[PDB]
Structure formats: structure tokens, C-alpha cells
């Protein structure tokens, strides 16, 4: 499959092998595309292609109306036509195959996204939240003009929004574990809670198994157990804020009687509600789009600048025991984990998802 998009007037069209490019931590899948130029129409004008990564606030896109803040994080510019020498580019199979099938008016354009840039992330504030829509976008803009210092008209340019998604391989080592012990009033007898997850890294759609073990040497009773997954998303630019939202929950009527032991495995799956409501939830795309998932965890390299990532995302499973005197007491434990995007003769389809 191949996506393509043309400017208002078919004079210019962009072609991409995919909408999502994967970040592998050490390197990022290259953005290799091709553009179809019509030399006659262009005549004088040259065809350029720019890749922009920017944090934007106030609107759901980099458009003007109501965009109150914008910070450029990465910009790359290539002259596709005529093919500029300096911008050498060892074509990729997909590019060869595409220039051949499209014609000789089709020229390649290729971008190398640095590894430490933030991935595509967006957030739409909830009903009672006063912050605005914001996010990090990667925009590919193909346009034509004599030189870069001259005005470009919207009619001869194509703007596509691609996604850089983060992937990481499952790792070796002990699984996430946490425990706590509680002594209530008028007693030295302990209620001990221990839990763990089957892995440290999970992918969109994958179920999370939570092993919960309780040693109740108390005269108290555990009435119920609540297991939840929560997302934490911090806005780091312009209008600082901290959002928190449950993305999976399970309340079970399991009980743990006085001086008894209990264990059970609970399975839940963080999921973006098919019904897209504006909750202060960080996503990896517009909530409107089908392929949009919950944002992936932000990977924080040692000593890396946190602000310029724009929105920091993390997840945690929380295990809570509701105990049977004043108000019901609660014994809980939290377990961090990281959520990532899964691991990854020519048919054309629109890009607009």
C-alpha cells in the first residue's frame, strides 16, 4: 500500500510508504517518500519538502486560529526538484519502485529523524479542565517556490501529518513487584500486600496480568480489591499542568478473611474508549482518527532536557485493598510499567486517515 496527497490543484502530490515511522531508541525509521512534480507548471519554481516537529498549544493542529503557543523542536528542509547535489540521498527500494511506476517527474525526498526527539503525542482537556489542546506533531510539507525566501501559496503545497511512534523490546530481569504491610489501630498484627506484573514492557492492546498476594494476619476483612491502570501526563511547555486518568479498572468482590492468605491474577487492558470523549488523556494521534492509541510512555534518557519533550507520559498499575472504627482503611501498592507501540505491485490510497 502507498499513500499520497495532492495540493488543492493536482499540480503537486506527495507519496509515502506509511503514516507511522518507528523510533527504535537507537535510531528512527527514515521518512522516505517521493513527490510528483509537473515541470511545465513549475517552470521557474523549485519543489521543496520540509519536515517539522513542533509542540503546539491552543488548537488540535499547527493551524493559526487560536494557536496561542508553538515551539519548534526539529526542522529539516530538502530541495527535491531540481535534485540538489548536497542533499544526496541513497534511494530506498520503495523509492526506486515508486519513481519507476510514477514517471521521471517523480523525485525522492528523505528525512532522518534524530533519536531523542519526542514522539507524536496530543491531549484534549476534559470538560472541567481549563487548559487547552496541545501536542507534538511531525508535519511533512511539500511546496514549490523559486527560493526559500519567497511567498508560497497554499494552492501549490501539500501538508501531511506523520507520526513517530516509540517501540522498545521486552527486557531481561525481575518483573515489576511492590509490597507494603499495614498495622491498624489497637493492634500489631500486619496485613501484607504484594503484587507484580508479568512484564515491564507492554504494547497497545496487550493485556496486563497482575498477581496479587495478600497475607491477612488481622481480625479485619478485605471487602474488595480494586485494580486499575492510570496514566499521568504532564504538560511541560507554556501552560504547565498535570493530568491523571484511569484507562483500565476492575473492582472485584474478592474477600480476604481474618488470618488467611489469598492470591489471584487479575488481567486488564489499558484501552482508548471507542467513544472519543475529551478527557485530559494523552493520545498518540487525534482522538478523531481510528488508528489513534493511548500515548506511549515517554522514555527519559539520563540527564536529557525534559521540557523540550513537551508532554511527559507514564503509566502505573495500582492495587488496592478495601478493608472492613472510623472510615474504611485502604492498603495499596503501585507498579510502574511502560507502554509502547507494537513492533512493525503498488496500490495507492489517500493519506488523510
UniProtKB/Swiss-Prot annotation:
SUPFAM superfamilies: E set domains. At the plasma membrane, is rapidly dephosphorylated, a process that is required for clathrin binding and ADRB2 endocytosis but not for ADRB2 binding and desensitization. Once internalized, is rephosphorylated. The ubiquitination status appears to regulate the formation and trafficking of beta-arrestin-GPCR complexes and signaling. Ubiquitination appears to occur GPCR-specific. Ubiquitinated by MDM2; the ubiquitination is required for rapid internalization of ADRB2. Deubiquitinated by USP33; the deubiquitination leads to a dissociation of the beta-arrestin-GPCR complex. Stimulation of a class A GPCR, such as ADRB2, induces transient ubiquitination and subsequently promotes association with USP33. Pfam families: Arrestin_C, Arrestin_N. Beta-arrestin 1A is found in cortex, cerebellum, striatum, pineal gland, retina and heart. Beta-arrestin 1B is found in spleen, lung, pituitary and kidney. 1D-myo-inositol hexakisphosphate binds at residues 244, 249, 318, 320. One of its GO terms (molecular function) is clathrin heavy chain binding. The modification Phosphotyrosine is found at residue 41. GO terms for cellular component: clathrin coat of coated pit; cytoplasm; cytoplasmic vesicle; cytosol; nucleus; plasma membrane; pseudopodium. It is found in: Cytoplasm; Nucleus; Cell membrane; Membrane, Clathrin-coated pit. Residues 1-157 are annotated as: Interaction with SRC. Functions in regulating agonist-mediated G-protein coupled receptor (GPCR) signaling by mediating both receptor desensitization and resensitization processes. During homologous desensitization, beta-arrestins bind to the GPRK-phosphorylated receptor and sterically preclude its coupling to the cognate G-protein; the binding appears to require additional receptor determinants exposed only in the active receptor conformation. This is Beta-arrestin-1.
